[PDB]
Ligand binder design. Structure first.
Ligand code: MNP
Ligand code: ZN
Length: 257
């Protein structure tokens, strides 16, 4: 099955998921000189005051911080969106070294990591139905650079020891994802896809311009996770990013001048 190796990594995905070579795949390189300012875009509305985190999971590809999405508690609205999108989970992608890790790139620059806050459009009732629709998901993407520590991340970092291997989970209540956001909500937006299989073309991407800073120590703890299951040969969870895909017939729009 799919992964991030020589034998099963992104360059192989298309054999099981032919949409890999589709018209609206993610991630992409954001060419800042060609992304046009769109005065019709709205400010983003990120309403996470009532978000209810429940659990953290190592799924063998990343770790997921999961939320109770059984009510409108943590929602994304505005920006490029019509309607209301409920937070279901966040996860990251990162590198073996600080010079790579992000999925999106900015004028070909790779950041050390990228955070994905995944939301589904409430008009479709559940996540599984939403991923079948072109406007089913909104993913908020936030770059990480290595510098100062992010205090708001440390709760996440310190639980990782308990979910080292694939299939491990841990109770993870009361975590506030507001602590992961940068000061500005300036963004780029474009239509795209999930970045892991099944690679469905269901996402409005919203990529923030301003990275967050995390410390080397924080990112180092991400790189101690394992792709493998308990008591299998250790293969560190690093370089779990899909490279940029062809933009094709898409426009990337900027919310800012
Ligand atoms: O389990 C998975 O890998 C599929 C999946 C599920 C939810 C979000 C995703 N994304 O690309 O943001 C991908
Ligand atoms: Zn992701």
């Amino acid at each position: 099955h799919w992964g991030y190796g020589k034998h099963n990594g992104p360059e192989h995905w298309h054999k099981d998921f032919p949409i890999a070579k589709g018209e609206r795949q993610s991630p992409v390189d954001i060419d800042t000189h060609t992304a046009k300012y769109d005065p019709s875009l709205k400010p983003l509305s990120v309403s996470y005051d009532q978000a209810t985190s429940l659990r953290i999971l190592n799924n063998g590809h990343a770790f997921n911080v999961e939320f109770d999405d059984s009510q409108d508690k943590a929602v994304l609205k505005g920006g490029p969106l019509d309607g209301t999108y409920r937070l279901i989970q966040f996860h990251f992608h990162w590198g073996s070294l600080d010079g790579q890790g992000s999925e999106h790139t900015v004028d070909k620059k790779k950041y050390a990591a990228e955070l994905h806050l995944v939301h589904w459009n409430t008009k479709y009732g559940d996540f599984g139905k939403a991923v079948q629709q072109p406007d089913g998901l909104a993913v908020l993407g936030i770059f990480l650079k290595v510098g100062s520590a992010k205090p708001g991340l440390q709760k996440v970092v310190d639980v990782l020891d308990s979910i080292k291997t694939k299939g491990k989970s841990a109770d993870f209540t009361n975590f506030d994802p507001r602590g992961l956001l940068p000061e500005s909500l300036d963004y780029w937006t474009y239509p795209g896809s999930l970045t892991t299989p099944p690679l469905l073309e269901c996402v409005t991407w919203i990529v923030l311009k301003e990275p967050i800073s995390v410390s080397s120590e924080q990112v180092l703890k991400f790189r101690k996770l394992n792709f493998n299951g308990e008591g299998e040969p250790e293969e560190l969870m690093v370089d779990n990013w899909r490279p940029a895909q062809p933009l094709k017939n898409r426009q990337i729009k900027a919310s800012f001048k």
